């Protein structure tokens, strides 16, 4: 008399009504940013990667920041480097400073420390800032005083117990006339020398085409420095001295989107660990799986 | 912004006159100049403008007055030299020197002015 | 060009008309003011915000192809003329406005 339990709901074959469909695939991104624990991914409008180290004029709001996970950046960004050029070795500054934990501003140099130098003229009307031409503040772009150059023989201890990044550029001269009259030397070089690092450069004078205003360009390099070791400058003109040191201590979304998971995407947050989803592959974090498909569930819960 | 001019009088048609001009109270060679001329019923009209030495480029003078005029640029002695020649009788109106604002990549209008000074041409 | 137009306690606004090729949805347009036997002043460089230095006399705004300029509490000592000035692009310099006078009595 007694017969099989008979219910309702709502590869052998195509489609097969179901009892219950636990799904395992989900879509519901909140489209916005998370928060996550504790360490807000840095929030930037406009400035780039390499303008906001280098200190673009538009970029005074953030100045001091605690630690961060990520960066948040958008594509094509209007606040780049005013000044044509790139710098070298530029990708794998974007893999280190990912995990920076606390990023903090420390003055190594002062400003005084170059007395026979000028200072003032280093502006470059570029990136103008309050209606007047001005320049990285990052940086400082050593002139000529006295119709004279002394050679610059600087050097630094490190006597602090955290590593310490540092920044420094070349200039190219657009041609033979603005050498001669910025730089008394119409030859010149750049030396650097530390424990594990040799380099020797030189300008490179050759006619260039106009790309956003002035035909010249800049070339930067950076470098990592041991917590017991010195470093030492040497240079006889079309020198770049920086001002500023972070003190790094040990161990990237492009998208742009308004404002609690280990989950995100350049669209939106994941909330859920859960294993298998299909939207944008292209994660950060612990991404569950990645499935191009619309329909996955398997079916149990009553009938028994 | 105290600007200082000179210059200016009365001379005959296609003859040279110079005139300078001064100023303080601000880092001229970070300052971007140029001249004006003002004209009575019209007003104010276009003459050229002045690059910056850590910039290079050079000063491009507008069409209709392209040829005769030129300017100068001594950031040392903190002074603008002005050379007029081949003058006629349209010339006569008076000038106005200014520093122009700095925006995006360009200094399109100005932001100071001085107090100017007269020349005309005459027979 | 730039085209403009030619009692105390009233208030009057002047308005700027131009071309798309010379004004628009950019901001870069300024405006001016002149007294007889005096030098030109700034008194609004951006559309909608206030220099330093100056009263409260001034204010404006921008919509379209044409900017509007309000003038606030007019009294006797108003009588000058405003000059303007608007943005072109990467050429040399901006197109200066045909001026207005004002006229109190």
């Known amino acids: 008399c007694i017969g099989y339990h008979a219910n309702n709901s709502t590869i052998m074959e195509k489609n097969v009504t179901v009892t219950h469909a636990q799904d395992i695939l989900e879509k519901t991104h909140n489209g916005k940013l998370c928060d996550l624990n504790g360490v807000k991914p840095l929030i930037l409008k406009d400035c780039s990667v390499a303008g906001w180290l280098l200190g673009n004029p538009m970029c005074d709001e953030f100045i001091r920041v605690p630690e961060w996970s990520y960066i948040v950046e958008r594509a094509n960004p209007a606040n780049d480097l005013c000044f044509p050029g790139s710098l070298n070795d530029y990708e794998e500054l974007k893999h280190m400073l990912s995990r920076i934990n606390h990023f903090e501003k420390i003055q190594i140099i002062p400003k005084s420390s170059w007395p026979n130098h000028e200072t003032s003229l280093g502006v470059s009307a570029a990136c103008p800032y309050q209606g007047a031409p001005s320049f990285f503040r990052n940086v400082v772009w050593l002139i000529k005083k006295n119709d004279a150059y002394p050679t610059i023989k600087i050097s630094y201890n490190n006597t602090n117990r955290e590593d310490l990044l540092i920044l420094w550029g070349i200039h190219h001269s657009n041609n033979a006339e603005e050498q001669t009259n910025l730089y008394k030397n119409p030859i010149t070089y750049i030396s650097v020398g530390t424990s594990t690092l040799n380099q020797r450069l030189a300008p490179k004078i050759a006619t260039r085409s106009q790309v956003n205003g002035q035909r010249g360009r800049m070339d930067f390099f950076w470098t990592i420095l041991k917590p017991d070791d010195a470093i030492h400058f040497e240079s006889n003109g079309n020198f770049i001295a920086p001002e500023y040191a972070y003190k790094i201590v040990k161990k990237i979304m492009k998208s742009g989107v308004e404002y609690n998971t280990k989950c995100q995407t350049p669209v939106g947050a994941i909330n859920s660990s859960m294993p298998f989803h299909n939207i944008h592959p292209l994660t950060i974090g612990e991404c569950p799986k990645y499935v191009k498909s619309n329909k996955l569930v398997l079916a149990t819960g009553l009938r028994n | 912004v105290q600007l200082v001019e000179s210059g200016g009088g009365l001379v005959k048609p296609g003859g040279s006159l110079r005139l300078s001009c001064e100023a303080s109270?601000?880092?001229?060679?970070?300052?971007?100049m140029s001249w004006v001329r003002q004209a009575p019923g019209k007003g104010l009209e276009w003459v050229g403008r002045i690059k910056i030495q850590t910039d290079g480029g050079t000063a491009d003078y507008a069409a209709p007055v392209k040829g005769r005029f030129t300017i100068s640029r001594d950031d040392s002695k903190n002074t603008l030299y002005l050379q007029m020649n081949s003058l006629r009788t349209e010339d006569t109106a008076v000038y106005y020197c200014?520093?122009?604002?700095?925006?995006?990549?360009?200094?399109?209008?100005?932001?100071?002015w001085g107090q100017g000074t007269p020349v005309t041409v005459s027979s | 060009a730039l085209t403009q137009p030619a009692s105390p306690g009233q208030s009057i606004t002047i308005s700027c008309t131009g071309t798309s090729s010379d004004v628009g949805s950019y901001n870069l347009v300024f405006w001016y003011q002149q007294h007889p036997g005096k030098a030109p002043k700034l008194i609004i460089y951006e559309v909608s915000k206030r220099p330093s230095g100056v009263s409260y006399r001034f204010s404006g705004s921008k919509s379209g192809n044409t900017a509007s300029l309000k003038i606030s509490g007019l009294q006797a000592e108003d009588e000058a003329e405003y000059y303007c000035?608007?943005?072109?692009?990467?050429?040399?310099?901006?197109?200066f406005g045909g001026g207005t006078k004002l006229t109190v009595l």
């Open positions: 109270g601000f880092i001229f060679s970070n300052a971007w």
């Open positions: 200014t520093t122009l604002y700095c925006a995006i990549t360009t200094c399109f209008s100005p932001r100071y």
């Open positions: 000035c608007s943005y072109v692009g990467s050429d040399t310099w901006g197109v």
